[PDB]
Design a protein around this ligand. Structure first.
Ligand SMILES: COc1ccc(Br)cc1S(=O)(=O)Nc1cc(-c2ccccc2)ccc1O
Length: 309
C-alpha cells in the first residue's frame, strides 16, 4: 500500500558553519553532482567545500576585485564567476586554475549561468547588457541591449533555448538564445532583484525590492503565487525551488533569517536563525534536503542546514 507524503513543514536544523571568507559572501551554489558547494565573496575568492560535511576543500583565486556570483557546469567540472573587475572567469575546479577570462562588459558583472549543455555562459552586468559567451573559445557570441539599469539575474531554461533576465529597471525579459531577440517583456515597476525559471519550465520566480517574491506564468502574464513576510528592499537575494522533499520556496532576507514557504499555500513554514547579517544567498542541494545559506560582512560564514523532509 503506497502513499504520498505531504509534510506540513520541513525541520531544517543547523549542521555546519563554514568559515574562511574575509568579506561578505555573495553567492553559494551546489554542484550538480551533489558533491560540492562553491562560494564566492567580495574578498575576490571562490571557495569549494564538501556539500555533505562542509569540509573545506580549496580556494580558487585570480579575480582582481570582488565576485558577485559563481555557477557550475552541468558535469560539475567547471565553474564560472562574475566579478567587479568587469570579467567573468571560467575555472577548472579540479586544478583550481583559470581556463578563460571573458572580457567585454564595461562595468561590474553581477550574475552568470551556464546553459544545461554547458557550451554557453550567460552574464548580466551593471553595464545594462546581457552577454552570451562560447565556453570553448572564451569569446562573446552576442551582446543584448537588455535593460536600462543594472542586470540582476540571468538564467537558462532546461533546453537552453531561452534566457530570462531581470533588472533594476523593473523589467523581466525572455530572450531567444539562438537569435538574441526578445520574446517577451513582463512588467508599478519596482526593481527586479532576482529571476529564474521554475523546474517545469512554465513559470518564472521573481524577487522585487518591495519585500515580495512572485511566481509568474510568463506565457500568460499571470501571477500564480506571491510570497511575503521576509525583508528585501536593498540587496539582490537569490530564491530557490526546493525539489527534493516537500515543495518549498527558499530565500534569504535582510532580517538575517532564511525563509521557507509552502509553494502552494504561500504560508511561511520555517524561518532559520543563526546568521548575524543579511542572508544574501541560499542554495538547495540537488538530491538531498540540504540548504546552504550565506551572509554579509558582519557574519561572512556559510551555514549548512538539513531536514528530514
Ligand atoms: C516539478 O516542479 C516543481 C518542483 C518543486 C517546486 Br518547489 C516547484 C515546481 S514547479 O513550480 O515547477 N511545478 C509545480 C507547480 C505547482 C503549482 C500549483 C499551483 C499553482 C502554482 C504552482 C505544484 C506542483 C509543482 O510541481
Amino acid at each position: 500500500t503506497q502513499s504520498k507524503p505531504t509534510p506540513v513543514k520541513p525541520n531544517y536544523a543547523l549542521k555546519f558553519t563554514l568559515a574562511g571568507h574575509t568579506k561578505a559572501v555573495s553567492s553559494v551554489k551546489f554542484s550538480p553532482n551533489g558533491e560540492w558547494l562553491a562560494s564566492s565573496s567580495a574578498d575576490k575568492l571562490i571557495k569549494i567545500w564538501g556539500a555533505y560535511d562542509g569540509k573545506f576543500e580549496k580556494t580558487i583565486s585570480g579575480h582582481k576585485l570582488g565576485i558577485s556570483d559563481v555557477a557550475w557546469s552541468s558535469d560539475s567540472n567547471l565553474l564560472v564567476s562574475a566579478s567587479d573587475d568587469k570579467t567573468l572567469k571560467i575555472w577548472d575546479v579540479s586544478s583550481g586554475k583559470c581556463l578563460k577570462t571573458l572580457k567585454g562588459h564595461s562595468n561590474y558583472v553581477f550574475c552568470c549561468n551556464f546553459n544545461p549543455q554547458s557550451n554557453l555562459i550567460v552574464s548580466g552586468s551593471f553595464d545594462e547588457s546581457v552577454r552570451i559567451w562560447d565556453v570553448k573559445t572564451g569569446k562573446c557570441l552576442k551582446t543584448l541591449p537588455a535593460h536600462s539599469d543594472p542586470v540582476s539575474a540571468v538564467h537558462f531554461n532546461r533546453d537552453g533555448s531561452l534566457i530570462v533576465s531581470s533588472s533594476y529597471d523593473g523589467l523581466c525579459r525572455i530572450w531567444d538564445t539562438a537569435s538574441g531577440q526578445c520574446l517577451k517583456t513582463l512588467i508599478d515597476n519596482p526593481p527586479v532583484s532576482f529571476v529564474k525559471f521554475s523546474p517545469n519550465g512554465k513559470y518564472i520566480l521573481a524577487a522585487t525590492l518591495d519585500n515580495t517574491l512572485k511566481l509568474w506564468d510568463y506565457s500568460k502574464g499571470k501571477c500564480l503565487k506571491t510570497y511575503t513576510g521576509h525583508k528585501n528592499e536593498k540587496y539582490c537575494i537569490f530564491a530557490n525551488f526546493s525539489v527534493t522533499g516537500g515543495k518549498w520556496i527558499v530565500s534569504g532576507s535582510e532580517d538575517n533569517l532564511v525563509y521557507i514557504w509552502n509553494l502552494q499555500t504561500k504560508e511561511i513554514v520555517q524561518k532559520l536563525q543563526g546568521h548575524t547579517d543579511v542572508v544574501i544567498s541560499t542554495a538547495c542541494h540537488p538530491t538531498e534536503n540540504i540548504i546552504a545559506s550565506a551572509a554579509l560582512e558582519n557574519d561572512k560564514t556559510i551555514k549548512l542546514w538539513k531536514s528530514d523532509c
